[PDB]
Amino acid sequence: KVALGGTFEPLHEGHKKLIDVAIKLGGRDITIGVTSDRMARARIRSVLPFAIRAENVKRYVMRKYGFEPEIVKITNPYGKTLDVDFEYLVVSPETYEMALKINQKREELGKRKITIVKVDWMM
Amino acid sequence: MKVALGGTFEPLHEGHKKLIDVAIKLGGRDITIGVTSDRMARARIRSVLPFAIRAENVKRYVMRKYGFEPEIVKITNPYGKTLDVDFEYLVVSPETYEMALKINQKREELGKRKITIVKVDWMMSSTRIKRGEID
């Protein structure tokens, strides 16, 4: 249903709003993408390993929503978004431009664009 | 009130339906849908449907797809109720996003907590979305 990706370092209120919107749209279903260390460090001065960031997201979702989300490592900028016909792509101000690039690429490949849902996070 | 959404809804198109789906998934029955007054609709488009007809069109659509009659409020100023009522989320399209930012600017000036803006890029192709609540 829903694609959501991020680095999640630190896990701040903006991320929390993003996760809330993604879960409301996608249910207990969702897989959350968490960037590899390489991808994280291109975008930020990241000092937490993938496993730590992924577990921080997993425990937060369990505390707040009562399920352990599926986490997948994002090793490239597109993730699964060129191959899966997601209903919604849930993004923040920091991931919005890449969402636009994902849709531009989908359209270039004859794929339907995904509806982008940008959760503004006042950070 | 959990979620604010507003519009003229003439005609009620696939973009509006995306907005409505997102708003209902976020808020359930705890949503308020603002529909512009005739005065307000006419400043934006050459509107040929009265408020009552536009409101009923939205109500019937929501009943048909989601199984409830939504609360409709007439919007008679640019902000509707969004400077007064505390909403958790404000669901907007690219056409209404600048006004959402203005809403939060004024809320801050007035001493109200900001609302989380949820901008749906409604693309007026798109992948199919299964309408409904997910529960």
Curated annotation (Swiss-Prot), chain A:
Main location: cytoplasm
Catalytic activity: (R)-4'-phosphopantetheine + ATP + H(+) = 3'-dephospho-CoA + diphosphate
Keywords: ATP-binding, Coenzyme A biosynthesis, Cytoplasm, Nucleotide-binding, Nucleotidyltransferase, Transferase
Keyword match Transferase: yes
GO biological process: coenzyme A biosynthetic process
GO CC annotations on file: cytoplasm
Transmembrane intervals: none
Pathway annotation: Cofactor biosynthesis; coenzyme A biosynthesis
Name this polypeptide is given: Phosphopantetheine adenylyltransferase
Organism for this UniProt entry: Archaeoglobus fulgidus (strain ATCC 49558 / DSM 4304 / JCM 9628 / NBRC 100126 / VC-16)
